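User: Substrate binding protein. Structure?
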Amino acid sequence: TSTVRVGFDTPQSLSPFNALALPDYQTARLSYDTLVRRDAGGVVPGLAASWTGDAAQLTFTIRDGATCSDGTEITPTVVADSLSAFAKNAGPSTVVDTFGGLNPAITADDAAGTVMITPEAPWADLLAALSVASTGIVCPAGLANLDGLNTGSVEGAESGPYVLSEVEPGVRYTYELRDDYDSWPEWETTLEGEIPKTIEYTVVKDPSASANQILSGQLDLGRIMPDSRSRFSDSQLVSNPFGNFYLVFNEREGAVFADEKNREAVAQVLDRDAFDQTTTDGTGELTDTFGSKATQCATAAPRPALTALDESAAAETLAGVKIRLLGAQVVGAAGAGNTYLEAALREAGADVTLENVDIGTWAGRVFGQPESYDLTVFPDLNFTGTLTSGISRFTGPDLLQNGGNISGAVSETANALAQQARTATTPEQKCAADAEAVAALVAEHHTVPLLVESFIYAKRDGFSVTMLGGSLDDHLFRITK
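Assistant: Predicted structure:
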């Protein structure tokens, strides 16, 4: 067989420029090729054969013989026009994650075969950010029809290996391997099995339905929740690090958690092992940073000094403190992590009120109404695979002053280390600044790092799936039998 039927959630958009939910990135990865790709320890050549430069400026050499799905040659101009359209059309938050600002210089030299990218100020994450599926190259036909990219294939737009050949919106997305495609990334990791000629990305309603359909043979692979694990043989389960969870506090003047003592006290009631048990049934991994061991700089010194449990001192501090606790229902089954934290704070004598809401409602409150709550567990899907997005929640100007600092925290130390990281002249200078920034934020009780949730694929015999290097949006399906 040359077909894999994969369970996934309904895409919100098939346009890389409008990709917000995981399925949007999953589909973008099939249709459009990024300049570089994640592997263990860093990125590998994708549509770029090589690159020179640093945080201040990158120059990519485009690999020869790459073509759009209509046979159009992928030139530096094609690549530069796609990245310019990305900077222009994508959400401001993802454009800032990619270029450190909204107005990068992006210049093609067709003769030299090069694309030169100069961030407004140095931006060390640019190279890693250009592996994210939403930065995949859209060919001229797609750039001419931005609206049509949202709902299907625009003939000739694809730079990637697959074309969406058939679509039943919200039900099934049928991808067919291009006969003319031969621009595969130069992966360091060797993958067994054959590249599927057809991927049937198949919408599932709920995790329960995903597990049932893999077991009945209606799907070859799909995501399952930890509570369905026991229905499968170990051979059928493939676990990879996915979202990472950490606390965020409202530290604005006049709010309860403006006071460092109240923040330390929350750290004193939040038992990280119990939290992991309630949230993941121990399928997750505790973390002391904003990612897993596979996240860039996550193993670099120093290691944060986490506040030990002290339920006693918490009880003294928190008796009668009013806490607007905000929860996302993705933090454990039915938001079980949020109700664990509510109870832990209630036990210490806080006057706590929990709003446990869906991810959409949660994001509107955290990014749109930052003063409307006091404490949340942030369920981060960090596609970039660096510590930068975690550090950003607590550094620079407040969201209130058009910044990305959602906590309104003021840490002179972490602010300085954030400025050091983005200009870092070497990756190892970058990891030193990022690890010290996390260490300060933990020490000043601006956050508590909690865990990395596992993405558990259940799979039928003769199929495999790999996620390399901590990637979230580069699921490598292979047929072995």
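The CA atoms of residues 36 and 281 lie 35 Å apart. The chain is about 30% helix and 25% strand.
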